Design a protein around this ligand. Structure first.
Ligand code: PC1
Ligand code: PC1
Ligand code: PC1
Ligand code: 3PE
Ligand code: 3PE
Ligand code: 3PE
Ligand code: 3PE
Lengths: 112, 71, 96, 111, 80, 317, 96, 69, 172, 344
């Protein structure tokens, strides 16, 4: 029944060392200037986070290449099998079905 | 042989969980002894509650959750 | 058993007042992807004890569309903020 | 339902371990062949293992004599054979492949 | 066209190495007789238990003793 | 005495990340023609026990314009998964016999980027606001360079357990039948775990902008600590996969001796790369994943599907 | 409308993953495999409008094979048959 | 080329501990034998059988041929 | 350690949803899913099928939960806040929180109350209810993933994703 | 752009075939999943900020209407485990089934799916493609048919024409006037579906024809009712006579062939001793005609063609399959003794 006590040791040793390093000398008796100087070298920066298109398409493109490796995941379990002409010719399909999705998008990526 | 030593376990388990149930209470608004829940008289497999009844103390946990979370 | 009531109580993470409302529409698309795992789990508890041996490929395929579905829906939610900067579901122009 | 008694139980049970059962295990099944293969027809071809209790003892009683023969004739290479294969981890068969013929030096010949 | 397989391999020899491994991979299972042994090995690995049959008239083959010359040819692997 | 085994594995490895910071610079020093830490040791050897106490005396400020519950939760998840990943790993016996644990490595290596997305957001503005958004973007793209060619050896191993990964290599040292995959296995972990040539993560990263830019030495002491715990763990994972040692059941002592010598050698390379090569200028970093790394990885994937079939050499499971 | 192309030309598009007792790749059945094969034997040429009120026996036990509804109730009430008489004797059985 | 070898020799020992520790717990907790692994549910069935019949409550003590004579 | 380790997980999973089902300022919405996704995987990693649970970390929690947090910066980048520090969040948190206990309160804590609320009891060890054991094939759950019989299944789902890129190769 | 516009357009009808060719609830889930994936580009083409704020009001309405269907499958997965498309074995499932699917066909509840999309899409060209999504779930209610509660399927259908009728007398925008009376013609067919579920398809095949020929007439310039004035004396006066004929046919007047369904559909609704049910609906579609009269009072009476602009040039659009539509959508009432023995 240790899996599950194989990690709750590891996280309660993790959260131990945080509060002892951070929070315990955070109650110390120094002067502790609380003035708004804590931000470094970008003093005010009175703006909202602007949209960047070339850093959105990187999120979606990965997600659609991430799905069909989980289809591709039970290939070693698909070895000790019955009829294997089917198993080979279907395994080669998905990879090409992943490969074409490159080549269409490959004619327009952008400065990624 | 490993099959023929396993089926002998559950009939002992069914007998003790019935014979030490038939001596518990014989009420007139109670049970008949030897009945089944189903209409069809054919040997269906038993259940965890059939073998290990209302006991549920230690060894029943090692029976169910033994193979999972470890050797 | 009680392992199905919880979780069938947890299917009410649709709840339709919080399936399109209120604003910050990302909060509504959140529970659209979080309505899965109340279907991915509620299927997986039933195929697995009752040894079907074949229908357990269906929970694998249940993610594959709903990921591609929600990814499409997230593309358009940039387009509502590409024109504005804020999603804000109390945007309405085309009346009904 | 109706069950057989507490009698037709409590037979002479083979109380051995896992590796010593898997020790011989190979010479075992391929040479008895009357009580056990017919017991499968008593289980597959007709179900309800409450009817089929005779041949459950026919496979068991002959297996009692299988180990009783191997104790009297040749047990000196036997006990060291399942010694090394009990040196555990998956119980491989390629580790004690060297010491397998010292057990089978006479199993083909003596008995 | 015979220069096209030598004047793009001076510019981008990256995807050319991919097609060279994409090709010569679909082609070979139609070629060597090592395949269909890959299905022959994979057929005679017993997972389940062999249930027996019953004598009724036939008696085609394979009597009660297994080590008799009774069954088919799967003993070419030990010689392999 | 299972509980005495876990503490016998967390504690002797915090020295090996503290006695790597010292060998970080002695090895990097003789490349520059200069000695190691000369005066405090005597040979250096007592440097990190003095260089650790200073951090926990020095005042751990929190930034005034920061959030609260996110800023102090990412170093909890930093050391959590940096130390939990050491569990299912055989040497020669693992602590845990997972049925399928090779996949559990990616179940642990996936969530590490979900702290960088926190800490870049949790504290403050532009030198870690957008400057950490383009550090999540490089680490997500090097899983599909990783997960494919991790699967590309499993068609030859046979299954998902790690005990078969030592059994299949008793006569081969499997870097030979797959040496094109072994190249791109290296550069992936060289760029995913945020190291020196592909280095828009830490401190070479516009040379000013990092996720370390705001943590004072209280919470900062783990980030560095935890991070150095990944880099000796992809090295302990490469040398159980390609360059596999020999196991003898009667003598398990000679396993580890011949084993720890090998993971140390690959760990030298992460130091020995940094003293040669310059950076990659974020475009060309990702310009060589899609265009250049990726189509070869599918090519060998289709190669390693057919070749176990048309050899009649199916691995048994 | 239900065109049923796959009955004309003999490919199975799916048809195999439908019911609980169809193929079983290495022949490991379910927990209620014995009642599926028995119940489908009932209504084959029957047009299903008389099958709802004629067969009615081979379906009901099969519903009660799968959920074990009254089997768990006959078991639960034995916890109230005894187990108020914890202190009134009858341990039954003594270990083991 | 000299002083870097003590820097190695403290790190290098620090991974010789956990390999030798765990290998001498499983071999020590179960009495000079390796630890039984069980990947498949059939392989669990041998141990849980063996616990019922070995001597008291253990899967790591043997019965032997001489037990049943 | 108890027999009730499954039931004690699922109540957390129910309370994981009520965390983000109301209105938490969509960066703590990530802290409603990753909590629930692991706790939900704590349920599925019982019962035998471990491969089907460990994929929920890789493809859902590893794939979609980065992109769901890789946005909320490029859009919806207003000045952030925390839930429960406002009045509209706490008023809905407690509403199901009682019923999260009240459903548990009388489903079986009474003897049998009375006819309609006693058909499904809590426990005991019949939650798994899988005895007896099996064979050395797989769990299984293991020999289930097939590039055998299902071919019409894969030829759609492969091809349905291929138009998934071409729809998003445009508008953006 | 041109070739990929077919492959998007081709797979729309490939999504709906798998809905019909299926013996398995998993495949009918995939079937009109990918339709909701492959309509979203057709909404976009010219990128106007109403269209982007219209497809997103289209989108999540057909995400939940998808999502409740998979909930309805997994309930009767627990009950008897058969997955053939047939009766659903559970009244808690079939109730959740029918009023989930009532959003994709939109009935009278689940209301504003129909006007809020179809209005103001700058692609008014077509958007004849909203006849497939009325065709896929009707192919699902042909099988589920002997398992319903018989009250819900009528209460969504009695409300259908009573509120699809009133909704559009207050309109000018003729896309909404086509969007309305598209709930009404979904009211006549699912009021009948429990009673002899064929002679439902008769109403549907008529409804595809008469609506498809309405949009092709509209593709000269027509946007608004005031624009429907200014083409009688300008474009072609034969267009004014044609646009009269189809509307008066689609109102159900017995000299034309939109009276072909009702005339037959009351032959089935009574014969089942249900008389107060058709007499309500038959008198309800009467103020479904006051759309069409008062629309025909615009174009066919020369109502103010001002702002002198001459179209001295010919017309070259593509009026594809137009010459044969108002010759089977008007003149067929004598020639159908049995259309309901071909389709039966
Ligand atoms: C097309 C036939 C495929 C089957 C061939 C069977 C095997 C034959 C053995 C190889 C023969 C030589 C192959 C011809 C290669 C010609 C392609 C070419 O020149 O590229 C031009 C152009 C080059 O345009 P470019 O000017 O932008 O060059 C940039 C190239 N990189 C990115 C590498 C720097 O390439 C393409 O248009 C296609 C790129 C996408 C390729 C996707 C890889 C598929 C993955 C494996 C499946
Ligand atoms: C036939 C199936 C094989 C899959 C291949 C999929 C396309 C792979 C990319 C081919 C790269 C070829 C590059 C040089 C082409 C010569 C340039 C030219 O004259 O334009 C021709 C072009 C080649 O396309 P293109 O990618 O080179 O650039 C066209 C510009 N866009 C993408 C904006 C349309 O052919 C066409 O435009 C018609 C095809 C439409 C788009 C392709 C999808 C459908 C494919 C046909 C089915
Ligand atoms: C019945 C089965 C369902 C048919 C309903 C129509 C669906 C077809 C979908 C494609 C049609 C289309 O989009 O064309 C518009 C398109 C509009 O596209 P567009 O012109 O606006 O944009 C294209 C831009 N360029 C030209 C640059 C590429 O063209 C037309 O206006 C006329 C073409 C055909 C119109 C439909 C004809 C068939 C309709 C009658 C069916 C009769 C069925 C009888 C039943 C008994
Ligand atoms: C800030 C502090 C507060 C937070 C503190 C809590 C943080 C906890 C975060 C830990 C996240 C780790 C989750 C990893 C889950 C994967 C576990 C796993 O898959 O183990 C492998 C094994 C699979 O079974 P198998 O390999 O077949 O066993 C051999 C049988 N012969 O499986 C097994 O061996 C046994 C399976 C059952 C074990 C119990 C269930 C495991 C999960 C329990 C924790 C629940 C997760 C908590 C939410 C995670 C949040 C990140
Ligand atoms: C028919 C039978 C079958 C045939 C089988 C044949 C097998 C062939 C195997 C080939 C595939 C394996 C080789 C992998 C491809 C190499 C990666 C690559 O393509 O890099 C291209 C990169 C792009 O740059 P370039 O194209 O050169 O243009 C700029 C010129 N001005 O240019 C580069 O060179 C970049 C170099 C790498 C970038 C990172 C460098 C940082 C330092 C890394 C050092 C790593 C050292 C080794 C790793 C450890 C090894 C154990
Ligand atoms: C003789 C045909 C009519 C005389 C020659 C054509 C003159 C013409 O073009 O007018 C067509 C007229 C449409 O009326 P309108 O558009 O208002 O007039 C302006 C026309 N620029 O009217 C039309 O002809 C439009 C076509 C109406 C349908 C055909 C009826 C025309 C009669 C000829 C066919 C006779 C056989 C079919 C009817 C048999 C009846 C038993
Ligand atoms: C009542 C009896 C049953 C009725 C069903 C009969 C099947 C349909 C018969 C109508 C066929 C229409 C046709 O043949 O095309 C008409 C016309 C093309 O005329 P065309 O001779 O090619 O002159 C070209 C000069 N440039 O068309 C055009 O002007 C544009 C070209 C498009 C060609 C029409 C394509 C449709 C033909 C197949 C119809 C099948 C679907 C039926 C739909 C309508 C059903 C009523």
């Amino acid at each position: 029944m240790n899996l599950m006590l194989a990690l709750l040791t590891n996280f309660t040793l993790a959260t131990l060392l945080v509060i002892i390093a951070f929070w315990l000398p955070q109650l110390n008796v120094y002067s502790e200037k609380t003035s708004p100087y804590e931000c470094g070298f970008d003093p005010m920066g009175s703006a909202r986070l602007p949209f960047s298109m070339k850093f959105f398409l990187v999120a979606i493109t990965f997600l659609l290449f991430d799905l069909e490796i989980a289809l591709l995941l039970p290939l070693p379990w698909a070895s000790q099998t019955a009829n294997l002409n089917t198993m080979l010719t279907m395994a080669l399909f998905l990879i090409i079905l992943l490969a074409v999705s490159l080549a269409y998008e490959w004619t327009q990526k952008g400065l990624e | 042989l490993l099959q023929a030593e396993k089926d002998r376990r559950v009939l002992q388990m069914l007998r003790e969980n019935l014979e030490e149930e038939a001596t518990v209470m014989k009420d007139v608004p109670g049970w008949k002894v030897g009945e089944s829940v189903f209409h069809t008289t054919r040997w269906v497999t038993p259940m965890m509650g059939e073998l290990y009844g209302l006991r549920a103390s230690e060894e029943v946990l090692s029976a169910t959750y033994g193979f999972i979370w470890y050797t | 058993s009680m392992v199905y009531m919880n979780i069938m109580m947890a299917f009410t993470v649709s709840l339709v007042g919080l399936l399109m409302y209120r604003s910050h529409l990302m909060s509504s698309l959140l529970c659209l992807e979080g309505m899965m795992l109340s279907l991915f789990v509620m299927a997986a508890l039933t195929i697995l004890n009752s040894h079907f041996t074949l229908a357990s490929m269906m929970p694998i395929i249940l993610l594959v569309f709903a990921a591609c579905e929600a990814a499409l829906g997230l593309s358009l939610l940039v387009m509502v903020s590409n024109t504005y900067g804020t999603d804000y579901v109390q945007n309405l122009n085309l009346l009904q | 339902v109706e069950l057989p008694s507490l009698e037709d139980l409590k037979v002479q049970e083979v109380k051995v371990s896992s590796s010593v059962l898997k020790a011989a295990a190979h010479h075992y099944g391929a040479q008895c062949d009357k009580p056990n293969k017919e017991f499968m027809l008593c289980r597959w071809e007709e179900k309800d293992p409450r009817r089929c209790l005779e041949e459950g003892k026919l496979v068991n009683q002959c297996a009692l004599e299988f180990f009783r023969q191997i104790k009297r004739h040749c047990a000196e290479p036997f006990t060291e054979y399942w010694t090394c294969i009990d040196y555990s981890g998956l119980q491989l068969f390629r580790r004690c492949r060297k010491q397998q013929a010292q057990f089978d030096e006479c199993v083909l010949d003596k008995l | 066209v015979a220069a096209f397989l030598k004047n793009v391999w001076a510019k981008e020899p990256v995807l050319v190495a991919s097609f060279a491994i994409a090709g010569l991979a679909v082609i070979l299972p139609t070629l060597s007789p090592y395949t269909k042994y890959s299905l022959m090995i994979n057929r005679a690995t017993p997972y389940n238990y062999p249930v027996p049959l019953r004598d009724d008239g036939n008696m085609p083959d394979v009597p009660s003793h297994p080590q008799d010359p009774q069954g088919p040819s799967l003993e070419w692997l030990k010689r392999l | 005495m299972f509980m005495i085994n876990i503490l016998m594995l967390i504690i002797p490895i915090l020295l090996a990340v503290a006695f790597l910071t010292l060998v970080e610079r002695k090895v990097l020093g003789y490349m520059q023609l200069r000695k190691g830490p000369n005066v405090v040791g005597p040979y250096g050897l007592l440097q990190p026990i003095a260089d650790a106490i200073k951090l926990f005396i020095k005042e751990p400020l929190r930034p005034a314009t920061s959030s609260a519950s996110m800023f102090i939760l990412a170093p909890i998840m930093a050391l959590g998964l940096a130390l939990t990943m050491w569990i299912p790993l055989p040497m020669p016996y693992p602590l845990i016999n997972m049925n399928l644990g090779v996949l559990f490595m990616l179940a642990m290596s996936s969530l590490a980027v979900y702290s960088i997305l926190w800490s870049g957001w949790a504290s403050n503005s532009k030198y870690a606001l957008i400057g950490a958004l383009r550090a999540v973007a490089q680490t997500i793209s090097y899983e599909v360079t990783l997960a494919i060619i991790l699967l590309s050896v499993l068609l030859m191993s046979g299954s998902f357990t790690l005990s078969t990964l030592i059994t299949t290599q008793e006569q081969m040292w499997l870097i030979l039948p797959a040496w094109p995959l072994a190249m791109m296995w290296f550069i992936s972990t060289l760029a995913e775990t945020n190291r020196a040539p592909f280095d828009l993560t830490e401190g070479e990263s516009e040379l000013v902008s990092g996720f370390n830019v705001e943590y004072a030495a209280g919470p900062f002491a783990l980030f560095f600590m935890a991070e150095y715990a990944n880099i000796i763990m992809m090295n302990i994972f490469t040398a159980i996969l390609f360059l596999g040692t020999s196991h003898n059941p009667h003598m398990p002592e000679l396993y580890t001796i011949n084993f720890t010598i090998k993971s140390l050698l690959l760990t030298m390379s992460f130091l020995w790369i940094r003293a040669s090569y310059p950076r990659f200028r974020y475009d060309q970093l990702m310009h060589l994943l899609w265009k250049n790394f990726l189509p070869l990885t599918l090519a060998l994937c289709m190669w390693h599907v057919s070749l176990p079939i048309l050899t009649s050499g199916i691995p048994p499971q | 409308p239900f065109f049923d192309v796959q009955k004309r030309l003999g490919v199975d598009l799916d048809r195999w993953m439908t019911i609980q007792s169809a193929e079983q790749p290495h022949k490991i059945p379910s927990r209620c495999h014995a009642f599926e094969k028995e119940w489908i034997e009932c209504a084959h040429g029957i047009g299903s409008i008389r099958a709802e009120k004629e067969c009615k026996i081979e379906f009901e036990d099969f519903r009660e094979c799968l959920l074990r509804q009254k089997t768990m109730k006959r078991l639960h009430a034995i916890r109230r048959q005894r187990e108020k008489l914890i202190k009134e004797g009858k341990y039954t059985p003594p270990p083991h | 080329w000299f002083e870097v070898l003590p820097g190695i020799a403290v790190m290098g020992v620090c991974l010789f501990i956990p390999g030798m520790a765990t290998a001498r717990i499983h071999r020590f907790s179960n009495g000079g034998k390796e630890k039984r692994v069980a990947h498949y549910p059939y392989q669990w069935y041998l141990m849980e059988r063996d616990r019922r019949v070995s001597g008291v409550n253990r899967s790591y003590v043997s019965k032997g041929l001489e037990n049943i004579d | 350690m108890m027999l009730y380790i499954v039931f004690i997980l699922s109540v957390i999973f129910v309370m994981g949803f009520v965390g983000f089902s109301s209105k938490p300022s969509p960066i703590y919405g990530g802290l409603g899913l990753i909590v629930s996704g692991g706790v939900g995987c704590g349920i599925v990693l019982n019962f035998g099928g471990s491969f089907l649970g460990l994929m929920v970390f890789l493809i859902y929690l590893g794939g979609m939960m980065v992109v769901f947090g890789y946005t909320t910066a490029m859009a919806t980048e207003q000045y952030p806040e925390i839930w429960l520090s406002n009045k509209a969040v706490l008023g809905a948190f407690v509403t199901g929180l009682l019923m999260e206990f009240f459903m548990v309160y009388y489903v079986l804590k009474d003897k049998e109350v009375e006819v309609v609320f006693e058909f499904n009891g809590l426990g005991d060890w019949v939650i798994y209810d899988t005895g007896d054991s099996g064979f050395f094939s797989e769990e299984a759950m293991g020999i289930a993933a097939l590039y055998s019989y299902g071919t019409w299944l894969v030829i759609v789902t492969g091809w349905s994703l291929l138009i998934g890129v071409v729809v998003i190769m445009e508008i953006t | 752009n041109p070739i990929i516009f077919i492959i998007i357009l081709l797979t729309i009808m490939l999504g709906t075939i798998i809905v019909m060719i299926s013996s398995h609830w998993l495949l009918v889930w995939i079937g009109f999943e990918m339709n909701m994936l492959a309509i979203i580009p057709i909404m976009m083409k010219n990128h106007n900020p109403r269209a982007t704020e219209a497809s997103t009001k289209y989108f999540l309405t057909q995400s939940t209407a998808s999502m409740l269907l998979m909930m309805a499958v997994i309930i009767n997965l627990m009950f008897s485990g058969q997955w053939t498309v047939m009766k659903l074995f559970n009244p808690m499932a079939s109730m959740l089934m029918t009023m989930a699917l009532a959003m994709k066909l939109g009935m009278a509840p689940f209301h504003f799916w129909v006007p809020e999309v179809t209005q103001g899409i700058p692609l008014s060209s077509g958007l004849i493609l909203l006849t497939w999504q009325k065709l896929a779930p009707m192919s699902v209610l042909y099988q589920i048919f002997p398992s319903i509660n018989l009250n819900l399927i009528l209460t969504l259908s009695v409300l259908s024409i009573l509120i699809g009728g009133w909704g559009g007398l207050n309109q000018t925008q003729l896309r909404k006037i086509m969007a309305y009376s598209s709930i009404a013609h979904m009211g006549w067919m699912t009021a009948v579906l429990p009673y002899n579920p064929t002679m439902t398809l008769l109403n549907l095949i008529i409804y595809i024809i008469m609506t498809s020929t309405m949009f092709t007439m509209f593709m000269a310039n027509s946007t608004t009712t005031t624009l429907s004035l200014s083409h009688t004396w300008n474009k072609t006066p034969i267009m004014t006579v044609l646009i009269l004929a189809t509307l008066l046919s689609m109102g159900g007047l017995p000299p034309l062939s939109g009276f072909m369904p009702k005339w037959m559909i009351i032959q089935e609704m009574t014969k089942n001793n249900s008389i107060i049910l058709p007499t309500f609906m038959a008198i309800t579609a009467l103020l479904n005609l006051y759309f069409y009269m008062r629309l025909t009072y615009s174009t066919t009476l020369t109502m103010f063609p001002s702002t002198n602009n001459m179209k001295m040039k010919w017309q070259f659009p593509l009026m594809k399959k137009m010459t044969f539509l108002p010759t089977m959508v008007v003149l067929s009432t004598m020639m159908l003794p049995l259309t309901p023995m071909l389709s039966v």
